[PDB]
Amino acid sequence: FVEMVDNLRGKSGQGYYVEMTVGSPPQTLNILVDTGSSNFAVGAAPHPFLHRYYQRQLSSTYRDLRKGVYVPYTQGKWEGELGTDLVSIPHGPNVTVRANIAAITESDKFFINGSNWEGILGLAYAEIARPDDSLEPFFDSLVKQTHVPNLFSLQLCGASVGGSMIIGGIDHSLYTGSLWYTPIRREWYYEVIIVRVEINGQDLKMDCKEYNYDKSIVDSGTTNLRLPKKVFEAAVKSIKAASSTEKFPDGFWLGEQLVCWQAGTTPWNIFPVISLYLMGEVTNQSFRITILPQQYLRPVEDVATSQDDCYKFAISQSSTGTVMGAVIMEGFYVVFDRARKRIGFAVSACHVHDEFRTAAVEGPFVTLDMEDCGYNIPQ
Template identity: 25%
Template sequence: MMKWLVVLSALVALSECLVRTPLIKGKTAREDLQEKGLWEKYRKEHPYNPMAKFIQTGTESMTNDADLAYYGVISIGTPPQSFSVIFDTGSSNLWIPSVYCSSEACENHKKFNPQQSSTFKWGSQPLSIQYGTGSMTGYLASDTVQVGGISIANQVFGISQTEAAFMASMKADGILGLAFQSIASDNVVPVFDNMIQQNLVSQPLFSVYLSSNAQQGSEVIFGGYDSSHYTGQISWIPLTSATYWQIKMDSVTINGQTVACSGGCQAIIDTGTSQIVGPNSDISNMNSWVGASTNQYGEATVNCQSIQSMPDVTFTLNGKAFTVPASAYVSQSNYGCSTGFGQGGSNLWILGDVFIREYYAVFDAPSKYIGLAKSV
């Protein structure tokens, strides 16, 4: 389940408020823990549960992936205070650490100081966001938020008072959710919704390009998409639920044989999850088909010398085939090679970064469609 962390940086505005945010690669939290000799201990104490954020409990759940997703620089307040946040299409709230937090995770990250912002306003509600390995608690507030050169007035966000221990090993300070308001904790209006409502973007959509093989150039574009990032036509897939970016998946095939999602299933396009995640039996079958061995933590390892001979895996979405080669679904590190197929213990599939790196993704909120095209 290895995954590289990708850093959003160098925020550049496009014409007519189309905003491009580039990303660069960095070292994963997992690699950091492995180098410190703490990974085995962490895995035993915090079993991987990628489905935690998709369990609807009335509070917004977030990813428990130790190889947390994609993050970039935003600023909050007047004058602005800068923070790195994960851009997560699998959640809907924005939150950051605060000076009122004494958790170890907060000590390792930048902390927002409300007293230093002239535009800060306290909200009236507490905030609790559940992770698979713990939670963050805090308070709601509002202030000016700047993302990629766009300034959003009166954006409601969370400031933490406590944070889960595993956040101490993460590179990002907080999370910026890009899913729908219907799943936002306390029904907070998400950042991108406010961009649209305040007429700050030229088009009511955003797009994500994730580079591969440690290359730079990954980016999020708010207000449009870039045709230089993909080849061929964009396939537009209707959402089955405007909560997460959820669509219908017809099947998963290898060498023409259906190996998972037989008869159809539901899938999430999620930048906040590193792997492709599915039901335990389906993922086990897929890993078996590609020749992987699964350890006690559900991590499927392969011989690094076998990658060239391993089969493609095809995901059929809305009648359109999207193929992922072994070079994309196998990750290599100093610790060996593993597949990017993770067990989720639920019927809900997550098409995370392993998939998105292969397919440029365009998120059209008002029309409730996702556009996918082969990345270049």
């Protein structure tokens, strides 16, 4: 695994990517690591924001599947053609596999200027693959063709950013303390269950099904912690109360505006810690992961504003359920244990902390109320 350490790069707020090769002879591309989708999709035609792209005419091993694919997102969309080809991860496991590839021929608001990635590696399950669940995702092909163990782990390290994707195992050098596991509720997204939320120690006191309306997922391809409307409004109220010694524009709380302080003077202590309690592997047991403001107040690098440190509020409202994005994942080592249908969390070797508070993963906690917190009926 040591050879896989530090194999992720990126720019803050732009996405963590890993180097891959496609085709024969191999064409190198940087690929966004995305646990919230299930297609391997790469730019395959020129684009102003792309420095390079997949040139299929140069790959003898490309096979056309003679099928188009159209993928709209809330923001942005792309269109392309399906095929298969040989794929490798130079700083991953030492194998080459044949995998499905969506060649992106047209796109809108998909590629990001200066992000330095040219495609996306969807690491979730076939159920949410496009055009449908018959298109085998990359990691499924990897496991079937190489018998590398059916799990991977992600260590995303915040501020240029970096990290590690360990394919096929767990690297103990990347975390401290204990690994705590929460069950994968359903294999489509990496869906999990949140059973309690506290902000600076104070329970939001909602029916726990609200936390998972209509699902909660772990998503390396989303920046923010995204929360259902009801939970979001409660969270903002609590954070506002905690930080009330300073008043910020409403635009800040909507993520429409930055807040800035003179470089080095950010008042971290007036912002509360957020604790997310995740369902444990035993009935009505849970553990919590705790989030510092250094995680949910994201610095926006800009030379023009650099007399100051300026931040975006990286918690936002969702109508599609909770998303535990990078602001949650950064500073933790997150194990996607597909074989045992569970997600593990531990404190990352590259964790967030000032001299007063430290991000944590800890437990066990017990709850009397026997209610299932899943928004849908369990199976």
